[PDB]
Write an enzyme that holds these catalytic residues in place. Structure first.
Site, PDB file in Angstrom:
ATOM      1  N   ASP A   1      41.700  36.442  38.187  1.00  0.00           N
ATOM      2  CA  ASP A   1      41.136  37.075  37.001  1.00  0.00           C
ATOM      3  C   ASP A   1      42.163  37.463  35.954  1.00  0.00           C
ATOM      4  O   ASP A   1      42.811  38.508  36.065  1.00  0.00           O
ATOM      5  CB  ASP A   1      40.333  38.312  37.453  1.00  0.00           C
ATOM      6  CG  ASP A   1      39.546  39.003  36.359  1.00  0.00           C
ATOM      7  OD1 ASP A   1      39.353  38.384  35.270  1.00  0.00           O
ATOM      8  OD2 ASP A   1      39.053  40.122  36.613  1.00  0.00           O
TER       9      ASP A   1
ATOM     10  N   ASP B   1      40.231  34.633  29.465  1.00  0.00           N
ATOM     11  CA  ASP B   1      39.742  35.315  30.665  1.00  0.00           C
ATOM     12  C   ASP B   1      39.123  34.382  31.710  1.00  0.00           C
ATOM     13  O   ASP B   1      37.939  34.026  31.619  1.00  0.00           O
ATOM     14  CB  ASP B   1      38.756  36.433  30.267  1.00  0.00           C
ATOM     15  CG  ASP B   1      38.205  37.233  31.450  1.00  0.00           C
ATOM     16  OD1 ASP B   1      38.770  37.107  32.573  1.00  0.00           O
ATOM     17  OD2 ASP B   1      37.225  38.003  31.249  1.00  0.00           O
TER      18      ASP B   1
HETATM   19  C1  LIG Z   1      39.834  44.088  39.810  1.00  0.00           C
HETATM   20  O1  LIG Z   1      39.817  45.325  39.088  1.00  0.00           O
HETATM   21  C2  LIG Z   1      39.082  45.373  37.961  1.00  0.00           C
HETATM   22  N1  LIG Z   1      38.234  44.400  37.689  1.00  0.00           N
HETATM   23  C3  LIG Z   1      37.676  44.399  36.465  1.00  0.00           C
HETATM   24  N2  LIG Z   1      36.755  43.432  36.221  1.00  0.00           N
HETATM   25  C4  LIG Z   1      35.816  43.376  35.093  1.00  0.00           C
HETATM   26  C5  LIG Z   1      34.858  42.237  35.470  1.00  0.00           C
HETATM   27  C6  LIG Z   1      34.362  41.522  34.228  1.00  0.00           C
HETATM   28  O2  LIG Z   1      33.378  41.916  33.635  1.00  0.00           O
HETATM   29  N3  LIG Z   1      35.089  40.432  33.792  1.00  0.00           N
HETATM   30  C7  LIG Z   1      34.570  39.694  32.628  1.00  0.00           C
HETATM   31  C8  LIG Z   1      36.292  40.078  34.370  1.00  0.00           C
HETATM   32  N4  LIG Z   1      37.057  39.237  33.770  1.00  0.00           N
HETATM   33  N5  LIG Z   1      36.628  40.573  35.582  1.00  0.00           N
HETATM   34  C9  LIG Z   1      35.706  41.344  36.419  1.00  0.00           C
HETATM   35  C10 LIG Z   1      34.851  40.459  37.337  1.00  0.00           C
HETATM   36  C11 LIG Z   1      35.010  39.074  37.342  1.00  0.00           C
HETATM   37  C12 LIG Z   1      34.254  38.257  38.165  1.00  0.00           C
HETATM   38  C13 LIG Z   1      33.340  38.847  38.996  1.00  0.00           C
HETATM   39  F1  LIG Z   1      32.566  38.053  39.779  1.00  0.00           F
HETATM   40  C14 LIG Z   1      33.149  40.200  39.063  1.00  0.00           C
HETATM   41  C15 LIG Z   1      33.909  40.972  38.225  1.00  0.00           C
HETATM   42  F2  LIG Z   1      33.745  42.310  38.288  1.00  0.00           F
HETATM   43  C16 LIG Z   1      36.526  42.379  37.206  1.00  0.00           C
HETATM   44  N6  LIG Z   1      37.895  45.314  35.491  1.00  0.00           N
HETATM   45  C17 LIG Z   1      38.728  46.325  35.794  1.00  0.00           C
HETATM   46  C18 LIG Z   1      38.943  47.366  34.735  1.00  0.00           C
HETATM   47  C19 LIG Z   1      39.361  46.391  37.061  1.00  0.00           C
HETATM   48  F3  LIG Z   1      40.202  47.381  37.404  1.00  0.00           F
END
Ligand SMILES: COc1nc(N2C[C@H]3C(=O)N(C)C(=N)N[C@@]3(c3ccc(F)cc3F)C2)nc(C)c1F
Length: 385
Positions: free
Chosen positions: A36, A230
């Site tokens: 990610d 992303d």
């Molecule tokens: C690992 O920790 C953290 N993770 C995240 N994410 C935000 C999520 C999201 O909306 N998108 C677009 C993203 N690109 N990634 C996420 C994600 C990706 C695939 C998935 F199937 C589930 C997800 F949840 C994970 N945000 C913060 C602040 C975190 F600390």
């Protein structure tokens, strides 16, 4: 150069994410981890969940260290407990590092049934790490503790057709090259855009074309409130106004066939008789990015084979429209990354793009990375406040 040990180390697909095998703890506990570039925490399932067949068991690791601190992440949502442990990437650099790990103990709509991953590897910068920027991200730990160069590159490989439960587990989904660039993963030249700021992998889009026709919007609209790369997002997501102008232009270019409102909203699939997908009626989309040289830009061009996401229905070939609206800026997600080999050159604060050796195309059109173009006042394209 050539990083044979890391080539083909990813599995997955744009809709469920691409993951890499990792190990945590002593003795090593194997877990599949989503790659990610849109977050900066290493967070893994650490308690039973209906969608997990395995999870991190801290009590079984002799090298587990408890940081005695919780972390709450509402985005979906997850809650966890912070700690550190020894982490390795079996099909990666031959090193073991001491890294922060958020042990997920409670979650809602985070884990995906059948995704085959049990955690997420946030590859972006400390600024967006949770609970705050003092929690060192994995890649920062890796670079600090080893001689691994401060760069990684991603080749996400879309199959171009749906993969069933067994095929997706047996198929190669791409490569994550840690510490280098593998020249077998791309064709043509690599073109670089500056990383505007180190938080997300933020970039600046300076022009947008649909089949060579300029969308003709003030370039600040394309980057309102930011534009990021992303791998954790499926779609190409565009700011509301840009999405409205782009969909009008894509509809006009493809007007020989009428699609329902639900298709354009990314909700409903469209199907054609096996092998008859009318790729040629859909336009190519070009995003121009700020270059490294003053007043210079380059363009990346994607096909409908990238922005039409294959989905199972029958013997028909079915797809969902993988371009959608955003209220948080442009997101160059997996369906755009599938066209290119993407180099996250943290050391030189730049992102490279080249045509992927694994992009889906037809005999008449290919994805492209071309330049240079003379483009003025590109700093004005960046959004502030
Ligand atoms: C690992 O920790 C953290 N993770 C995240 N994410 C935000 C999520 C999201 O909306 N998108 C677009 C993203 N690109 N990634 C996420 C994600 C990706 C695939 C998935 F199937 C589930 C997800 F949840 C994970 N945000 C913060 C602040 C975190 F600390």
């Amino acid at each position: 150069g050539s990083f044979v040990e890391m080539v083909d180390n990813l599995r997955g697909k744009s809709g469920q994410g691409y993951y890499v095998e990792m190990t945590v703890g002593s003795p090593p506990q194997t877990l599949n981890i989503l790659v990610d570039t849109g977050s900066s925490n290493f967070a893994v399932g650490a308690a039973p969940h209906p969608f997990l067949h395995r999870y991190y068991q801290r009590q079984l690791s002799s090298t587990y260290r408890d940081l005695r601190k919780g972390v709450y992440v509402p985005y979906g949502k997850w809650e966890g407990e912070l700690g550190t442990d020894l982490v390795s990437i079996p099909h990666g650099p031959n090193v073991t590092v001491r890294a922060n790990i958020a042990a997920i103990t409670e979650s809602d709509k985070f884990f995906i049934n059948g995704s085959n991953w049990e955690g997420i590897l946030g590859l972006a910068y400390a600024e967006i790490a949770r609970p705050d920027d003092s929690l060192e991200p994995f890649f920062d730990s890796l670079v600090k503790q080893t001689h691994v160069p401060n760069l990684f590159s991603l080749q996400l490989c879309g199959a171009g057709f749906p993969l069933n439960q067994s095929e997706v587990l047996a198929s190669v989904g791409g490569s994550m090259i840690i510490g280098g660039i593998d020249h077998s993963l791309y064709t043509g030249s690599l073109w670089y855009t500056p990383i505007r700021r180190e938080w997300y992998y933020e970039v600046i889009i300076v022009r947008v074309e649909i089949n060579g026709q300029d969308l003709k919007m003030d370039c600040k609209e394309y980057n309102y409130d930011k534009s990021i790369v992303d791998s954790g997002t499926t779609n190409l997501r565009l700011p509301k106004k840009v999405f409205e102008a782009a969909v009008k232009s894509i509809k006009a270019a493809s007007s020989t066939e009428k699609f329902p409102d639900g298709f354009w909203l990314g909700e409903q699939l469209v199907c054609w008789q096996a092998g008859t997908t009318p790729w040629n009626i859909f336009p190519v989309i070009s995003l121009y990015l700020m270059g490294e040289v003053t007043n210079q830009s380059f363009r990346i061009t994607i096909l409908p084979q990238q922005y039409l996401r294959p989905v199972e229905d029958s013997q028909d070939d079915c797809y969902k429209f993988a371009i959608s609206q955003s209220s948080t800026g442009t997101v160059m997600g997996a369906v755009i990354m599938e066209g290119f080999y993407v180099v996250f050159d943290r050391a030189r604060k730049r992102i490279g793009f080249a045509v992927s050796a694994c992009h889906v195309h037809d005999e008449f059109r290919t994805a492209a990375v071309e330049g240079p173009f003379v483009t003025l006042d590109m700093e004005d394209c960046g959004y502030n406040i």
